[PDB]
């Protein structure tokens, strides 16, 4: 099973994930974290980990939430999202962790 | 009232006229007949595309020609600017726009060659049009695909292949990582390949590839047919089978039937790929015809979800067309053939589609040009892979994702395009092979 | 292999004559082969799935080249039955934008009889139309209402009334008059038909108005056709190129069901049928028009304000009216064309013509044609009724002269001057436009 | 039978008609003359007497055409019209002569 | 993001904002709750009629509130000017406009009283509306009536009369010279007077009066009913009988059903009289409600052919409403309650209707006020004539025609109104009698 | 004669209580008589055709006056069966603009049983609705999605998902959210129902979303209702005043045919039901709403951001839910109202409420009501799911306390504080909005 963007590349390291988060922030978008144990074509609403981090100022703050979500949900897929409120749509979504 | 023939210029050339924000504006490149002044040729185009004819008529004085007439208000070089009052046009009808702007004026003896370069559709008229039935944002939501260009490919041979097998090629492409595949523009229903058979077996392949990969898939099923009723029938069947997409050749089918399919598509929840077959009959020559950017505007107004934009005609020209399809406001830039500013009045954006003999080596340039919001089509670039469609699809998918990753990391994907692809090829045998072939 | 000079075309083959301007360095033989491949089966790289088929059954073949003209044959099974849309998608779908050609013009097309039989042709046809009108032995008179736009529905129909009662057989909406703020279609349709009925009762001759149903969607066009039929109109009108062939086919089917005769305006044709180096020659468009089913189509005037060659126009009229048209290089007819019993289409000559052109027009077209006088009717010094009388009389005087054995070209002016002695309206028209000539 | 505007007043004299024509001209409208022997609810297109007098500069010029129409068609109803081309509609219509 | 309650003013009061030509503008007369600043009350109206609520929500940051929010951009006296972006509204839906502008904001504790005075409908939004199905010019063409106001009258008693007799009153009114007659707004289908019976016998009277007089006639048959389907049924029957008119109480039936009847009316070729029953529930008080001029704008946008305008509320107020209904552009004039300029973007004009206890003595004033393009209704002013409806209709018709004649001749119909009527009365006994009665 | 203090109203009469502010110099008795005449038969001058009838059978009569309140009785035969539109046209059609009254408010109306039987009432009703939801013994939880406008369809349904899975029974479109460029209705309807099904499966409780079908024409509203039913939605929503009663009746009929429950938003009501001197009291609008057939209607909160009196609201809830409501001057109920077996309507309390208001809300409404928390759900410090849990828990804790015999007003804060000990979401909501009070 693939999980869309970047799922055809090798699994991302934490430093690669962090650079994607920096790309989200540098462009003024809102990073978010979601997780599910049931990925697939019929699931368009993964579980929110907290809320989209509107107040995050650094990529490391997001990475700390990722590690906390990863520790809390070790048997779930976990993805990073990037939301553009001017576009009213996600501009980036990729799985950061796989069970 | 005085009967007789007067120069068009006396009534339809007005260089003092100040265009209104509600006026529809046209930029015509005019080659007059030798001996015919430019002002007279331009006034003839304005007259015979609005209210006038070749001789004065008593009935002219029964209406308000100062209000209704089109006016050439500026001639710069060989470009005539003509303003058309809003009241001249039927709301929501691209067909009416064409019947006036390009109806007869291209065939006048007094004008040896005529090319419509650009058109300023006023905001008040744009709001009478529905725009794309889906739009980029909603389409990405329906697909659950964010952060990269989307990949497609035409199932080949163009004409010749049978149904359950035609669908095996679809299955292989989609299970290899392409998001979509498509019918050829001239594949409708033919003795070698009837539409009901193709629709049924193509969709079995789509459901299978989607279940195995876990990613949402689609096939642009061509509903183009000889009548509007037949096209609507084929769209209904595509929807009944759960297809997310249909496809129409919007120029060969025509705008009136195009509008009918666009309405039904939105009602049925289908996304509408628009193939621009025949466009080069209109838009190829720089001295006569209609430039594609005008066709693209009409396309976004009626409502298509994607339209082909070519490969790279010219780079400046293509960037202008991509902006016209995707942005909410596009400033003028005659360097890109944009003679007017274009406000899109909130109409949804259209996906540009790059297609035509492209393969893995072009991905860095394509990402740099278009960014995330575009479709990259690999027709023969998928089936022609050494190990078949499946492996070719994987090579193309990896190439796009690898380049997007590098871009997001801050790398210069143009100067490092080669290095990026070779890095990704070290962990993807399919990509390494594809790069060797082409 | 896509160039095969030893291939003999089949009677079932669809044939095309392309004028090719290849990219520099691309020889004619290879450019023709490329057009044949891209308009049939060919791809740009080898594909594994090609081995699961027999492409030879579907390949198009260039079988003859002379100069910059390539003759290409297409198997019958390549095309969807009864769909002009499919023909265009294949024959003119991508080969005009291909890189290896700089310019391309489709000059002619041989529609095989076996493909023609999948089309219904005109819903009425010349013979049945003349029967419905009870008009035999002369060209029929018409005219576009002017100004093109701006008249109210009621004043619009006043002009219709004056034209028809003065001797015109028909009048028509301008191609760009559909439904607009100054003139909505329901208002126009009602008032126009009041005028048509009034002029018919007062003159004793059957009348008609070509009510334009052209609209933004097929459904809207069908609605307007329904209303025209409910009013008893003998005619509707459609811009078949701007509306498009798919919606045109839908309107043609409905027209036959409702008993409506269908006038077809070729608006937009000059965008791509004008220049000799690129596009689609109108004679091809005329064949497609007759296949789908138009009762009339504009063909040009030769002598009017819009461009048109006399020899090419003679061939196009034959293509629209005859059951078999042999090839004729002098008229640009590259192929023999059998029409498989399809009904014939009225050619329509319109655009910048007036009384002095009638001898030429009768000479070119003969009786089976419509002559439209818009500005040449309303522009009469005394208005539309007098202008209509002048045009009707000029046409009848010339037809009479021809039938009596006179050379209407050599005696054209004399014939008009004779008729003018008994028709002051014609005399005044001849005086006004005596010095208004266009280049031929 | 009545004929709409002014038909419920006594028949107009030529001086009254002329004043109506002056009203049409003073407001920049186009005076016209029409006539019919079949007035009624089903007739919305009377016969034109010449064309609408776009070039008329004085009411007397119109009155001379009225007298000529009246002499030529003594057994017809004859009405004066006033047309406003900015409005695209008649702004005044009344019968000037009855048979 | 910070949860909690913030003053509306911080986000929805922006005195630096410059309204766009595409913005919809409102002028609200605001009476704040004592202790609530005017800026906060105005911002609350803007917030709760566009995007905001009473406390900050995390989802606010999922959209572009700078683009979508309404903004109070000016407060002058007790009038708040608020601008609404075009994207907030559904094309062609008066119902949507109401649901935002007047949906909830009139009931907030922080705003003690609120009155919507005027609204600037932008040209780009007006073009999504069809306007009147007929319009003044086309209506006059259908009637063949030019150069005078048109006359009507309500058949009375309001409720009580039977069918074949109700129609005898219609016959008498129309054969006496009235152009039209009408149903009372509350005459629909009742045990005393069922609609099918009334429609059948009223139309027999219309055909008869039209044949005898030679002038085209009509009756405004009320199709108002409990459901949209029932109203459409009654409109179909009216059309089947050859009626030129139907009538709807557009406020009591409602705008959604009004829009449905307006569409069917145009399809059937019916002209649509609109009765404003219930308007005073909304528009009577100067401190709270919606002024009628706003209702009149919505009426012209949906598409009514006539609407009542009152008798003379105020003269300045009525002249403003008449302009809003008939002109293509109406400049602002707060003296007449017009706070904005209103461009009508080519929508057809509406006939104003003056009704309410008027008789022959009012005709000079009515002609001076309205000119030719209006309906004058004489309900009891026709049936209450000493010799019945027929003679009353003749008196009213003569009075209008006589005054129009004098005006066209250059006479001052205000200073000579009395003299003009007495002159005409010398040759019309009906007029002389009517003047004596009232 | 239109004032008759000796007239005894019939059980078939329709009765009205008007508060009249007459024009100065117009005495109350004469103003009441004028209202009765103009709302029934009367004219302004004698007419010959009045003698062909028996108007006494149709006259309305003012039969009692106290202070500035006039009681007027209308015969049953004055009104069209089953048409609220007709009631309004007669009762509030012209008498509010009449010159002899300066202001006029309709306070109450006695709908006679014989007229009620011509109406169908709610399509579902409280009892059947609770059966369809399988929810008994507590007020039901809902909430409007915020921002009112601006969210995409997919993000809009994300908020729906978070709300429903957190414990809300329903969510709803804002009254002004119909179909707009940023959020078209078909997109919203599809994504919302995906969220509804998802939350229902994950929680095990039946869910719903009040999809707004309000549109510019009846036909469009019916189309949107059809699509909601095709998606399996249990609910649709309509703004019955802005859309209007005629189109509302059409939607209600279709809703029953399709099996849809019908939420009714009273947008625009405050334009004319707010001021005590002029308009129509909401209790009258509530009666009309129950007659046509709404399953819910907003009634106000008393304690929230929008105005509403506690006593009047108590009477309105009884008018919506009971089969017989006796007159009660303390609550502004001027007449006894029998409901002739019509189904009852859910009152809905919405607007600026949060957890601290739940004791008051339960005390006012009891179990048969919806409590809507829009800002009070999404405004929770941790978002919509936590907010929904806080509101659901507060409602259940208060219901439990009441059922156990506690005075939920006297112990309201204590009850919430007890529940908060086991529900951190409630604790956080209580802390955030602890100082947010409105005037009562
Ligand atoms: O038929 C074809 O050539 C394609 O399927 C491409 O095939 P490959 O991907 O195998 O080349 C597309 O239709 C063209 O690219 C469209 O041309 P345009 O962009 O001119 O519309
Ligand atoms: O719009 C016009 O110009 C006409 O109405 C001619 O008006 P006049 O009769 O006043 O010239 C016709 O549509 C053209 O002749 C069409 O051109 P073609 O027939 O070549 O398609
Ligand atoms: O019922 C009535 O009073 C009328 O029939 C007038 O009767 P008369 O002509 O016999 O007075 C009209 O409906 C009102 O004038 C409308 O009031 P508005 O102008 O307020 O809509
Ligand atoms: O638009 C609004 O304000 C609401 O969504 C409340 O949102 P919050 O829950 O965020 O306050 C409701 O429509 C109002 O309560 C209706 O007023 P009523 O119920 O009085 O008709
Ligand atoms: Mg293709
Ligand atoms: Mg034309
Ligand atoms: Mg009335
Ligand atoms: Mg709301």
CSV table of N, CA and C in Angstrom, one decimal, chain C residues 342-395:
chain,number,residue,atom,x,y,z
C,342,UNK,N,-28.3,10.9,-50.5
C,342,UNK,CA,-28.6,12.0,-49.5
C,342,UNK,C,-29.2,13.2,-50.2
C,343,UNK,N,-30.2,13.8,-49.5
C,343,UNK,CA,-30.9,14.9,-50.0
C,343,UNK,C,-29.9,16.1,-50.3
C,344,UNK,N,-30.3,17.0,-51.2
C,344,UNK,CA,-29.4,18.1,-51.5
C,344,UNK,C,-29.7,19.3,-50.6
C,345,UNK,N,-28.7,20.2,-50.6
C,345,UNK,CA,-28.7,21.4,-49.7
C,345,UNK,C,-28.8,22.6,-50.6
C,346,UNK,N,-29.6,23.6,-50.2
C,346,UNK,CA,-29.7,24.9,-50.8
C,346,UNK,C,-28.4,25.7,-50.6
C,347,UNK,N,-27.6,26.1,-51.6
C,347,UNK,CA,-26.6,27.1,-51.4
C,347,UNK,C,-27.2,28.4,-51.1
C,348,UNK,N,-26.6,29.3,-50.3
C,348,UNK,CA,-27.1,30.6,-50.0
C,348,UNK,C,-26.0,31.6,-50.2
C,349,UNK,N,-26.3,32.6,-51.1
C,349,UNK,CA,-25.3,33.7,-51.4
C,349,UNK,C,-25.7,34.9,-50.7
C,350,UNK,N,-24.8,35.4,-49.8
C,350,UNK,CA,-25.2,36.5,-48.9
C,350,UNK,C,-23.9,37.3,-48.6
C,351,UNK,N,-24.1,38.7,-48.5
C,351,UNK,CA,-23.0,39.5,-48.1
C,351,UNK,C,-22.6,40.6,-49.0
C,352,UNK,N,-23.1,41.8,-48.9
C,352,UNK,CA,-22.7,42.9,-49.6
C,352,UNK,C,-23.2,42.9,-51.1
C,353,UNK,N,-24.3,42.3,-51.4
C,353,UNK,CA,-24.7,42.2,-52.8
C,353,UNK,C,-26.0,43.1,-52.9
C,354,UNK,N,-26.2,43.5,-54.2
C,354,UNK,CA,-27.3,44.4,-54.5
C,354,UNK,C,-27.7,44.1,-55.9
C,355,UNK,N,-28.7,44.9,-56.4
C,355,UNK,CA,-29.4,44.5,-57.7
C,355,UNK,C,-28.4,44.3,-58.8
C,356,UNK,N,-27.3,45.1,-58.9
C,356,UNK,CA,-26.4,44.9,-60.0
C,356,UNK,C,-25.7,43.6,-60.0
C,357,UNK,N,-25.7,42.9,-58.9
C,357,UNK,CA,-25.0,41.6,-58.8
C,357,UNK,C,-25.9,40.4,-59.3
C,358,UNK,N,-27.2,40.7,-59.5
C,358,UNK,CA,-28.2,39.6,-59.8
C,358,UNK,C,-27.8,38.8,-61.0
C,359,UNK,N,-27.5,39.5,-62.2
C,359,UNK,CA,-27.0,38.7,-63.3
C,359,UNK,C,-25.9,37.7,-63.0
C,360,UNK,N,-24.8,38.2,-62.3
C,360,UNK,CA,-23.7,37.3,-61.9
C,360,UNK,C,-24.2,36.2,-61.0
C,361,UNK,N,-25.1,36.5,-60.1
C,361,UNK,CA,-25.5,35.5,-59.1
C,361,UNK,C,-26.3,34.4,-59.8
C,362,UNK,N,-27.3,34.8,-60.7
C,362,UNK,CA,-28.0,33.8,-61.4
C,362,UNK,C,-27.1,33.0,-62.3
C,363,UNK,N,-26.1,33.6,-62.9
C,363,UNK,CA,-25.2,32.9,-63.8
C,363,UNK,C,-24.4,31.9,-63.0
C,364,UNK,N,-24.0,32.2,-61.8
C,364,UNK,CA,-23.2,31.3,-61.0
C,364,UNK,C,-24.0,30.2,-60.4
C,365,UNK,N,-25.1,30.5,-59.8
C,365,UNK,CA,-25.9,29.5,-59.0
C,365,UNK,C,-27.0,28.9,-59.7
C,366,UNK,N,-27.6,29.5,-60.8
C,366,UNK,CA,-28.9,29.0,-61.3
C,366,UNK,C,-30.0,29.2,-60.3
C,367,UNK,N,-31.1,28.3,-60.5
C,367,UNK,CA,-32.3,28.5,-59.8
C,367,UNK,C,-32.2,28.0,-58.3
C,368,UNK,N,-31.5,27.0,-58.1
C,368,UNK,CA,-31.5,26.3,-56.8
C,368,UNK,C,-30.5,27.0,-55.8
C,369,UNK,N,-30.9,28.2,-55.3
C,369,UNK,CA,-30.1,28.9,-54.4
C,369,UNK,C,-31.0,30.0,-53.7
C,370,UNK,N,-30.6,30.5,-52.6
C,370,UNK,CA,-31.1,31.6,-51.9
C,370,UNK,C,-30.1,32.8,-52.2
C,371,UNK,N,-30.7,34.0,-52.6
C,371,UNK,CA,-29.9,35.2,-52.6
C,371,UNK,C,-30.4,36.1,-51.5
C,372,UNK,N,-29.5,36.5,-50.6
C,372,UNK,CA,-29.9,37.3,-49.4
C,372,UNK,C,-29.4,38.7,-49.6
C,373,UNK,N,-30.4,39.6,-49.4
C,373,UNK,CA,-30.1,41.1,-49.5
C,373,UNK,C,-30.5,41.7,-48.2
C,374,UNK,N,-29.5,41.9,-47.3
C,374,UNK,CA,-29.7,42.6,-46.1
C,374,UNK,C,-29.6,44.1,-46.2
C,375,UNK,N,-28.4,44.6,-46.2
C,375,UNK,CA,-28.2,46.0,-46.5
C,375,UNK,C,-28.7,46.4,-47.9
C,376,UNK,N,-28.7,45.5,-48.8
C,376,UNK,CA,-29.2,45.7,-50.2
C,376,UNK,C,-30.7,45.7,-50.2
C,377,UNK,N,-31.4,45.4,-49.1
C,377,UNK,CA,-32.9,45.6,-49.0
C,377,UNK,C,-33.2,46.8,-48.1
C,378,UNK,N,-32.8,46.8,-46.9
C,378,UNK,CA,-33.1,47.9,-46.0
C,378,UNK,C,-32.4,49.2,-46.4
C,379,UNK,N,-31.3,49.1,-47.1
C,379,UNK,CA,-30.6,50.3,-47.6
C,379,UNK,C,-31.2,51.0,-48.8
C,380,UNK,N,-32.3,50.5,-49.3
C,380,UNK,CA,-33.0,51.2,-50.4
C,380,UNK,C,-33.5,52.6,-49.9
C,381,UNK,N,-33.4,53.5,-50.8
C,381,UNK,CA,-33.7,54.9,-50.4
C,381,UNK,C,-35.1,55.0,-49.8
C,382,UNK,N,-36.1,54.2,-50.1
C,382,UNK,CA,-37.4,54.2,-49.6
C,382,UNK,C,-37.7,53.1,-48.6
C,383,UNK,N,-36.7,52.4,-48.2
C,383,UNK,CA,-36.8,51.4,-47.1
C,383,UNK,C,-36.9,50.0,-47.6
C,384,UNK,N,-37.4,49.2,-46.6
C,384,UNK,CA,-37.2,47.7,-46.8
C,384,UNK,C,-38.2,47.1,-47.8
C,385,UNK,N,-39.5,47.7,-47.8
C,385,UNK,CA,-40.5,47.1,-48.7
C,385,UNK,C,-40.1,47.4,-50.2
C,386,UNK,N,-39.7,48.6,-50.5
C,386,UNK,CA,-39.3,49.0,-51.8
C,386,UNK,C,-38.0,48.2,-52.2
C,387,UNK,N,-37.1,48.1,-51.3
C,387,UNK,CA,-35.9,47.3,-51.6
C,387,UNK,C,-36.2,45.8,-51.9
C,388,UNK,N,-37.1,45.2,-51.1
C,388,UNK,CA,-37.5,43.8,-51.4
C,388,UNK,C,-38.1,43.7,-52.7
C,389,UNK,N,-39.0,44.6,-53.1
C,389,UNK,CA,-39.6,44.6,-54.5
C,389,UNK,C,-38.5,44.7,-55.5
C,390,UNK,N,-37.5,45.6,-55.4
C,390,UNK,CA,-36.5,45.8,-56.3
C,390,UNK,C,-35.7,44.5,-56.5
C,391,UNK,N,-35.4,43.8,-55.4
C,391,UNK,CA,-34.5,42.6,-55.5
C,391,UNK,C,-35.3,41.4,-56.1
C,392,UNK,N,-36.6,41.3,-55.7
C,392,UNK,CA,-37.4,40.2,-56.3
C,392,UNK,C,-37.6,40.4,-57.8
C,393,UNK,N,-37.8,41.7,-58.2
C,393,UNK,CA,-38.1,42.0,-59.6
C,393,UNK,C,-36.8,41.7,-60.4
C,394,UNK,N,-35.6,42.1,-59.9
C,394,UNK,CA,-34.4,41.9,-60.6
C,394,UNK,C,-34.1,40.4,-60.8
C,395,UNK,N,-34.4,39.6,-59.8
C,395,UNK,CA,-34.2,38.2,-59.9
C,395,UNK,C,-35.1,37.6,-61.0
